[PDB]
Amino acid sequence: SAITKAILNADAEARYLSPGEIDVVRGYLASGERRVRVARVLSDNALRIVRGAGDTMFQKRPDLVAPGGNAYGEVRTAKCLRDLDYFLRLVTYGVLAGDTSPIDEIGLIGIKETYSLLEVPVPGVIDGIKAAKQQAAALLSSEDAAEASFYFDYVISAMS
Amino acid sequence: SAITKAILNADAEARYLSPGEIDVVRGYLASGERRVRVARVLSDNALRIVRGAGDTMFQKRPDLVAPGGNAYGEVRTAKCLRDLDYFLRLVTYGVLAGDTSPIDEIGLIGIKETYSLLEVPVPGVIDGIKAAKQQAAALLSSEDAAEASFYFDYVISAMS
Amino acid sequence: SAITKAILNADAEARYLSPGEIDVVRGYLASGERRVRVARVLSDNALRIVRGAGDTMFQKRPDLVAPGGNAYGEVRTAKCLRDLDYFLRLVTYGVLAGDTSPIDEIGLIGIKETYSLLEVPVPGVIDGIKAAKQQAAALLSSEDAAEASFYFDYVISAMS
Amino acid sequence: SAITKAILNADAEARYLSPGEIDVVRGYLASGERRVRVARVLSDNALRIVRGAGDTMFQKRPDLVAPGGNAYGEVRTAKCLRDLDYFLRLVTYGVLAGDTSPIDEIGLIGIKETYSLLEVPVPGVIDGIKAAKQQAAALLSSEDAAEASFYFDYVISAMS
Amino acid sequence: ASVDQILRASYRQILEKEPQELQRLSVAESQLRNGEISVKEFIRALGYSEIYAKFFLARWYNGKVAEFNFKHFLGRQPASATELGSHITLIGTKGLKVAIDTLLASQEYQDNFGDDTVPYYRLQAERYVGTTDAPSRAYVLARSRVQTALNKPTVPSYSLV
Amino acid sequence: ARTISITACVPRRTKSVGASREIQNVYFTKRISFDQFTPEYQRIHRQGGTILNVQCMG
Amino acid sequence: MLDAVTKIINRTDAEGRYFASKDFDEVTRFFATGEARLRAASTISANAASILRESAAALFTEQPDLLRPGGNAYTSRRYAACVRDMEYFLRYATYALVAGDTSVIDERVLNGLKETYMSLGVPIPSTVAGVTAMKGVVASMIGSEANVYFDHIAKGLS
Amino acid sequence: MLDAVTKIINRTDAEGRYFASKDFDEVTRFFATGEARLRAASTISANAASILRESAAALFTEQPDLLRPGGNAYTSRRYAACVRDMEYFLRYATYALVAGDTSVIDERVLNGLKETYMSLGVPIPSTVAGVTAMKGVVASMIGSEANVYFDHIAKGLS
Amino acid sequence: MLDAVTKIINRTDAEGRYFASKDFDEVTRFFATGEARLRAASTISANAASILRESAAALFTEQPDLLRPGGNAYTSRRYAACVRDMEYFLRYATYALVAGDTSVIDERVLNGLKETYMSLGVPIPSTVAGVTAMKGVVASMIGSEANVYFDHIAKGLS
Amino acid sequence: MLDAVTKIINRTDAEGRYFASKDFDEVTRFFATGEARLRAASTISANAASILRESAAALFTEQPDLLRPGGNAYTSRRYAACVRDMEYFLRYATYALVAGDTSVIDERVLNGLKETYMSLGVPIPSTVAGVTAMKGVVASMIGSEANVYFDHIAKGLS
């Protein structure tokens, strides 16, 4: 959270929250209702966003679901769609929490070597996440789209 | 400033600015206009605020200007009031910067040893800064008063 | 003590007592009788030393006992004179030990923070301790006064 | 010196000389005439002491001057006596300084691996220094003999 | 030792994790590779990282933080209640960076590691006798910490002292 | 932000000689922060070292 | 560490589900009380010296034996440690008040504190009396927003 | 480091004066363009991997001799070091774009880079060519908004 | 650590009083015996190598099974560790003798020594036997001056 | 560092001879002046805060430009550093007085101080004026006992 990050900085320096930390927390608390609105819209349309993202990613890379592909098979395609759903949920978490920590502890620390061991092609994951981002921006207004795109782009960048 | 703190945090971790850091910078940039008007009010009435704060502090603690007091004498009293002017200008620097780094760099780091050596009573300085905060709040609206009071209270807290 | 200081010096280097440390210990053991005399004289006249020191300090800085002073009131004046009595007792302790470790461990470590939080004027404490130094130097011969003045001056210097 | 060590202790803690260190320095200054007398006696009888000690060491351990010994030959025996002269001079330095640092830096630090590389028997050196102890004590008074034998003991212990 | 080995050892000693597991300190690593900074400077760069406060201070008592600091930067454990308490007071009143700076500036650090070695544990009595208030207790605590080095113990710090 | 590069020669007289390589400790130039300038200055003086050069690049 | 929002996120993530209406209501309640909680936290921060002064006075007037020789607060050093511990309690109470959650008190403060005090001989009942005095002093200033965090510290200590 | 606001603060502090009308106008100008500079920084950050990719492509197509054996970019290690240097330049140019001041580039990029590159044998003209190619790519991606900081790096190196 | 004078100071400070006649008598009593203890400690320091040699000889003539293979004193390293431990005991008995108090032994030596010896497999009764042998060797030279400190070490190990 | 006794020892060691009569005379005169040197050192120690206060007051009354904005003594930090330097000079002059030699000043104060002051922009002539003011203040208290060491500092800076 923004609050957790500010408090951890104060605690590590053994001091009360500074005027800048207080202003950060005030800004986050002021943005709370907008964050909740965006997160609610994303959570209500999770199935549509993931279904469209998977369609777009498999259309752009038919080799994934072709024989010999990483996602080939019912169980593997299920796991791929499940990962897309996971990343969408984590983006909603980041939007609510006002920082990238939930996305880090839950889904981005160790994902690189995880996907490396399983030979999961990271460009395909990035394509799926960009597809999810576009599906989401379709549902959100321009300002809400920008807010959600911050965390979508963070996930994309952390994958690469 | 607020921007410098975020950039240093990002650079220490050798990364680009995170979405949370972007929101911090954006909130500072949005707050810029009210910071400018608060600092303009404080700066344009610096003589009035310093004079009133000095009067209140010397009424509260007449022993400072009594014989044997640290502020006794025309030179010492004048340059006491000079210290109060210094601290008000530093508070304006804080209001503009969005953090307390200008205050610490210019006025707070070393003031404890300085005042301990030169016999300057920290409670008297705190009363002076409190009077200055009241003079400023008289000139400001309640919101602007709280905005400046953040940095006034930070300076007082650094004193004690 | 002097002996303890020599033993820690030897222990730090994992060696036996050096000829220098042996000389140090032998000097302390030879000085013991003079130290006992000085400490006895200070301990027997503790009451009048503290009373005269308090009188001198309060006449020097009557702001302490004026309304709004740190020592205003019977309870706070008694606390002030109690602190002077404390420091005299630790001066005797340091005369007996032959070094300042008892003074530091009982009375000086934390005193800066204690008096800073309580807003006790350390310069006023220093005036009181210097007053006690003159009071005891009146009671002692030139050599004994010189012996005790080392610890009185050590306490004063550790104040500021 | 004792002065040097006291000043280094004071500098380690960024303070002025404490009453204990001032007492140590005063003790070093008081003992100056006795130290100077002891060193003068040890320096005047240097040839006598070295000859007696070398003769005693060679008699006690004739294998050192026996064929194939480390000190066989007039050149190597001369270097042995020269080393005894060196260590006696170092003992005089230690007496004058009031501490063992001149001994350590000039001759003691690095002598162990020096004698390992040269295959010098350290028990032989120890018996030679003990012989110098008895010769020196025969020329000094009992108190002076003890004072110089402190540093003789230091050298003997450091060799072993 | 090459810079690669020193970097791997530094991350293992200070953060108890492999370099691939972390977000590496690229610029500090490049400065160490260029000779601009010493190994000790890289060690304080590691101790100064936000990841260090997240790993060793965020969810821990100040006693645990002190034990972490001693293990990481001194290669041993706090032995006495005085030493542990002083370090805890440093963490609680001056911050983590000041306490770590105290540990790195302490004569023990220069004596054992100087400016060019990663800290390590030395289960010898010469490690502790001149340095520590309670050398035998210091040995016991350090040996226990070494014996179960993989574990992050949850036994209270003042229970051990 | 400002930093200082300091060049110092620290002799190894107080210590005994060791077969380990020690030339890197004896003669060095190191980059330090300003807040660290005083502690290492005094540290070099404590060890008998000589400050050969001080520079501030800007 | 954890605040209220991270607590809700962790709960939903452990259930492996998206936020629902109830979780959104909970997080909106957090955002609603946040501004009052920052006002209380800033007031405590600005007046921390006064709060410590009043609370230490209240404690040592209630229990004068602590300051007398033989008491656990008898020295300049032991008194400084005592007021330092009260400073810790207030600072971490402010942290918890901003976070809206008490887990920071459990992790950074309470865990190991009982053993620290038993090892040193700090009298825990008297420390709880000090925490109660601080709670009263702070409540006289900000209202009743920090009462639960001081009650948490007191229950954890006892 | 320094931003524009701290630069103005330091200029006013060197004269020991409060802000005047001119200083407030400069601060207002800085706040006026802050949103556009944040947008450009976010666009750069979202496309850092690509920007770096075609920047390296442009550098090594304009000078293929660097990659060939004997060149300063010839190894996997030296190629990765080159790419890391270019990514440094992009990240610090983005920092200066947010800050509005070239102070971070001077103090933490340009400072000492010239003698480091001569001591390493790094070809400074080729590095300048790389910085200019990355300037071109970034200008095609966000416009002329970040040109100044790239020219600052290029002039400091040249 | 403590010596006798600091112990008296700490007692009187625990009652929070100035030194009385009994305290002065008890401290001049310590000053009285300082010369004998200094002389004995200097004698021990002067002959530490001989005392260590004779004590190790006595211990291993009493218990030759330690030196045999599988004994805790069988190796060059473990034999050296054993003699180094006896040298520690001698030196800290010298410190206690000068100090006049056994505390330095209590925290410097005894604190954690049984745990060390049980974790290392060192036989504790054999170490007590070695301490007693060293006690006899030191007594033969300096009288009964160090018997209490060696007995303190032995009883703390036992 | 080395004192006067160690300096004579080193000079006798340079030509590898025992002390002559002149060496013993030098040592004797050092021991003769030691008591007055100790008295002066104690006087400076007891009055270090006041000596520092009127020394800084003299320096900044003579040169008000330093304290004005843009001066090297203008900030809280920079004034504190200046006074800390003056306290350094006073304390190391006291050390030199006790040691009876100027080696401590040469090796722990003057060594690397030109380079430091030129790197930071400290005005060396103004520092020398401050050292002269401190010399006068000290001579007002202890007389001419310690002019040589302040003169050594000034000439090492001048």
Ligand SMILES: CCC1=C(C)/C(=C/C2=NC(=C\c3[nH]c(/C=C4\NC(=O)[C@H](C)[C@H]4CC)c(C)c3CCC(=O)O)/C(CCC(=O)O)=C2C)NC1=O
């Ligand atoms: C809540 C946080 C979380 C994340 C993010 C997560 C990702 C994740 N995906 C995994 C497997 C997988 N992930 C994928 C998905 C990838 N492969 C396809 O080609 C696509 C390019 C791409 C998805 C867009 C696939 C196909 C597998 C199975 C591969 C295998 O069995 O080796 C695994 C290994 C364990 C398992 O099989 O379930 C993890 C840990 N797990 C988590 O607990």
Ligand SMILES: CCC1=C(C)/C(=C/C2=NC(=C\c3[nH]c(/C=C4\NC(=O)[C@H](C)[C@H]4CC)c(C)c3CCC(=O)O)/C(CCC(=O)O)=C2C)NC1=O
């Ligand atoms: C001022 C400090 C200082 C010391 C202490 C010192 C000792 C010393 N003695 C040496 C040689 C020697 N030293 C000795 C003396 C030893 N061998 C005898 O058997 C005895 C057991 C014993 C003397 C009691 C001998 C015989 C040599 C000749 C070895 C050779 O030339 O091969 C050497 C090697 C260089 C040389 O030939 O002089 C040193 C450094 N030198 C110094 O500058």
Ligand SMILES: CCC1=C(C)/C(=C/C2=NC(=C\c3[nH]c(/C=C4\NC(=O)[C@H](C)[C@H]4CC)c(C)c3CCC(=O)O)/C(CCC(=O)O)=C2C)NC1=O
């Ligand atoms: C592995 C590479 C390496 C080298 C080459 C090296 C040389 C070296 N020699 C040193 C000292 C020394 N070296 C010598 C030796 C010289 N003086 C004599 O006249 C001889 C003619 C000559 C040797 C044949 C001496 C006498 C000193 C001590 C000088 C002093 O510090 O006062 C020192 C300072 C550290 C110390 O005192 O131990 C270094 C760094 N160090 C290294 O780590």
Ligand SMILES: CCC1=C(C)/C(=C/C2=NC(=C\c3[nH]c(/C=C4\NC(=O)[C@H](C)[C@H]4CC)c(C)c3CCC(=O)O)/C(CCC(=O)O)=C2C)NC1=O
């Ligand atoms: C044995 C070692 C020891 C020392 C040294 C010591 C000093 C000490 N003085 C205190 C309060 C005090 N100290 C003073 C003394 C000041 N009044 C005037 O200003 C004078 C300038 C000055 C004395 C010369 C006074 C009046 C108080 C009580 C009022 C307050 O809370 O500030 C306190 C806080 C606890 C209390 O109220 O009693 C301590 C710990 N306590 C110790 O246990």
Ligand SMILES: CCC1=C(C)/C(=C/C2=NC(=C\c3[nH]c(/C=C4\NC(=O)[C@H](C)[C@H]4CC)c(C)c3CCC(=O)O)/C(CCC(=O)O)=C2C)NC1=O
């Ligand atoms: C951030 C969370 C945190 C807490 C809470 C904390 C408590 C704490 N208190 C300590 C000592 C102490 N604490 C006290 C306080 C007690 N004195 C009694 O009279 C009072 C009733 C009571 C306080 C209200 C005292 C007197 C000591 C010194 C004990 C001693 O050294 O004998 C110590 C040992 C370190 C030292 O000596 O300063 C700790 C770790 N530390 C932490 O890091």
Ligand SMILES: CCC1=C(C)/C(=C/C2=NC(=C\c3[nH]c(/C=C4\NC(=O)[C@H](C)[C@H]4CC)c(C)c3CCC(=O)O)/C(CCC(=O)O)=C2C)NC1=O
């Ligand atoms: C954050 C600020 C920062 C900068 C700017 C920086 C530059 C920098 N680049 C370096 C190496 C290098 N830099 C390059 C780049 C060059 N190769 C040529 O082909 C190209 C024309 C050109 C780049 C466009 C190369 C190849 C090396 C490796 C040199 C070698 O190992 O010999 C090094 C030496 C240490 C290391 O290899 O990590 C530094 C310090 N380091 C920093 O910490």
Ligand SMILES: CCC1=C(C)/C(=C/C2=NC(=C\c3[nH]c(/C=C4\NC(=O)[C@H](C)[C@H]4CC)c(C)c3CCC(=O)O)/C(CCC(=O)O)=C2C)NC1=O
């Ligand atoms: C398995 C590993 C191991 C080794 C290597 C070892 C060496 C060793 N030899 C010893 C005694 C001894 N060692 C020797 C041998 C010496 N006599 C001559 O001078 C020669 C120069 C030299 C041998 C070539 C002698 C004579 C003794 C008994 C004399 C004494 O009490 O020192 C001792 C002391 C304990 C004892 O009395 O046995 C040890 C520890 N011990 C071990 O547990």
Ligand SMILES: CCC1=C(C)/C(=C/C2=NC(=C\c3[nH]c(/C=C4\NC(=O)[C@H](C)[C@H]4CC)c(C)c3CCC(=O)O)/C(CCC(=O)O)=C2C)NC1=O
């Ligand atoms: C200053 C106080 C102090 C003491 C006393 C102390 C004892 C001590 N003894 C140790 C090992 C040892 N200690 C012994 C001694 C035993 N061998 C048996 O024959 C004898 C009965 C007995 C001695 C008389 C041995 C053999 C070891 C090595 C055990 C091993 O490595 O497995 C160790 C482990 C570290 C090392 O190897 O140096 C310690 C800490 N440490 C201290 O800091």
Ligand SMILES: CCC1=C(C)/C(=C/C2=NC(=C\c3[nH]c(/C=C4\NC(=O)[C@H](C)[C@H]4CC)c(C)c3CCC(=O)O)/C(CCC(=O)O)=C2C)NC1=O
């Ligand atoms: C812009 C940053 C800055 C600050 C903050 C600053 C404070 C400051 N005030 C000083 C002196 C002084 N300051 C005061 C202030 C008054 N004394 C009374 O008791 C009042 C309680 C109190 C103010 C409310 C007084 C009386 C002196 C004269 C002390 C003396 O000359 O001994 C000094 C020593 C140099 C001088 O005499 O001018 C500094 C450095 N200087 C700076 O460059």
Ligand SMILES: CCC1=C(C)/C(=C/C2=NC(=C\c3[nH]c(/C=C4\NC(=O)[C@H](C)[C@H]4CC)c(C)c3CCC(=O)O)/C(CCC(=O)O)=C2C)NC1=O
């Ligand atoms: C114990 C030996 C020792 C000495 C001698 C020493 C001098 C010294 N003075 C310094 C800075 C300084 N020195 C001064 C003093 C000057 N200001 C002018 O007005 C005056 C004329 C003049 C003093 C009389 C100032 C203002 C600074 C700070 C400069 C800056 O921060 O930019 C620094 C840089 C590190 C720091 O600021 O913390 C050193 C090392 N440090 C030492 O450890």
